[PDB]
Structure 1
């Protein structure tokens, strides 16, 4: 918590943003996406949750509907509705006013870049290797790690998408695997549930253990409000410490956590 601010003021902290940050905007949740896919396929949700977890439910929608295109179209329209205002969001304001040179996200929505451009901060948005060619060292790198709504082929949603990302041969995978070399990652709004991220940090811990400088690895941090000792032990094996809060509100806890980063 104090060493995190020490590395943050040094400029050696990468921000990783999950869906829990975008949960405070009034966006549809993951379960509402499951309900929409279930009603689109002729099911009803609870009769579609006894069959597969989630990758099975995006994979089955892709297989029955051909492509991910109608799903991407619906997600593009409801994730960027006109009712959502980025100025009434203290979490996105604290993200924009804080100093993070590299920002990663698994969200396909553009509210991080909207908050960055709304509060007068320049950025470089990376979703392809041609955007890796445009990286400015004096601007924020916003890497859409799991895709964007500007490309159906980039969205990491279904089982085959995660199976493609497991080999770590994407340009974004290579860029992330070298960005975690010698830099701390701060996970906010993210539960570390995606299999490719856990395999990436497992291979990073194995890489630091193979060189026999396991004490010298930069220490990562994850902010979850509800505590979990199981995840705590498993993530502390990968040098990812847990920062918890006693506040029951997740958005308030994230605001009080990012308050330390917006200031100076």
Structure 2
């Protein structure tokens, strides 16, 4: 843990935000989402959740209706409603006041940039190979790794999609596999139930060992609010270290951790 703080100081950490952060705001959850697909398609909330995971339940909706548009619209209009006030989420404040040079995310919403602007800051949004050409070394970069609501040919919201995007051949993958060469990543707001983070990291590691400079590989982290015995074991195999807490209020726990960074 202390080692991590060592680096925020020098300038070698990358933030990878996930869906957990979007809780204080009050946005819908994944649950409500699938409830919707269910009502729409004619089923019942629970009966539906029995035939598949999620990147399957959603792919059904799409295969049936015809395309993803009809959903993107509900989500965009609903998640970005005018009843959510950013000024009241401490978590975002800290992220906007810290000093992380590069921020990656898997959310689809637009609150992380709204925050950076509200507390006075600058940024460049990168969702395509065209923006990679405007990057300025004097502003923060925000990369939408899983698409935004400003295109439907990208948003990764279904199996087939969460597939092709596993050979890492898109422009935005080639850019991340060259940004971690020499850098530690601090996952937050994430959940240990996705193998993208186990193919990126199980694969970054093997390289150092092939060169045999292992000792050099920078060190990752993954604050998880609740603690688990078994996972630490496996995630240590690929340099990733957990940093749990004791406060049972998950939200509070998260706000905390982000004070050791805002430190003026």
TM-score over 0.5 (shorter chain): yes
Structure 1 residue 159 displacement after superposition: 0.5
Structure 1 residue 251 displacement after superposition: 1.3
Distance 1:131 1:13 in 2: 22
Structure 1 residue 116 displacement after superposition: 0.4
Match of 2:63?
63
Distance 1:229 1:213 in 2: 29
Match of 2:262?
262
Structure 1 residue 137 displacement after superposition: 1.0
TM-score by length of 2: 0.97
Structure 1 residue 235 displacement after superposition: 1.4
Distance 1:96 1:106 in 2: 17
SS in 1 for 2:242: strand
Report Cα offsets for 1:97-134 as digits up to 9, x if no partner. 00000000000001100000111110111110111111
Mean Cα displacement is larger for which, 3-12 or 91-100? 3-12
Distance 1:34 1:145 in 2: 22
SS in 2 for 1:23: coil
Mean Cα displacement is larger for which, 185-194 or 5-14? 185-194
Report Cα offsets for 1:192-214 as digits up to 9, x if no partner. 43332321111111222221122
Distance 2:152 2:194 in 1: 19
Report Cα offsets for 1:15-34 as digits up to 9, x if no partner. 00000001211001111111
Match of 1:20?
20
Distance 1:81 1:150 in 2: 17
SS in 1 for 2:173: helix
Mean Cα displacement is larger for which, 243-252 or 39-48? 39-48
SS in 2 for 1:60: helix
Report Cα offsets for 1:124-163 as digits up to 9, x if no partner. 1111011111111111010010110111111112101111
- Checking the alignment, whether the CA contact within 8 Å between 1:162 and 1:196 is kept in structure 2 is no
Match of 2:138?
138
CA RMSD between the two structures: 1.1
Match of 1:165?
165
TM-score by length of 1: 0.97
SS in 1 for 2:88: coil
- Residue ranges of structure 2 left out of the alignment (5+ in a row): none
Report Cα offsets for 1:152-184 as digits up to 9, x if no partner. 111112101111101101111111111111110
Structure 1 residue 230 displacement after superposition: 2.3
Aligned residues: 264
Distance 1:230 1:81 in 2: 40
Report Cα offsets for 1:220-264 as digits up to 9, x if no partner. 000111011222122111111001010111111111100111112
Mean Cα displacement is larger for which, 193-202 or 217-226? 193-202
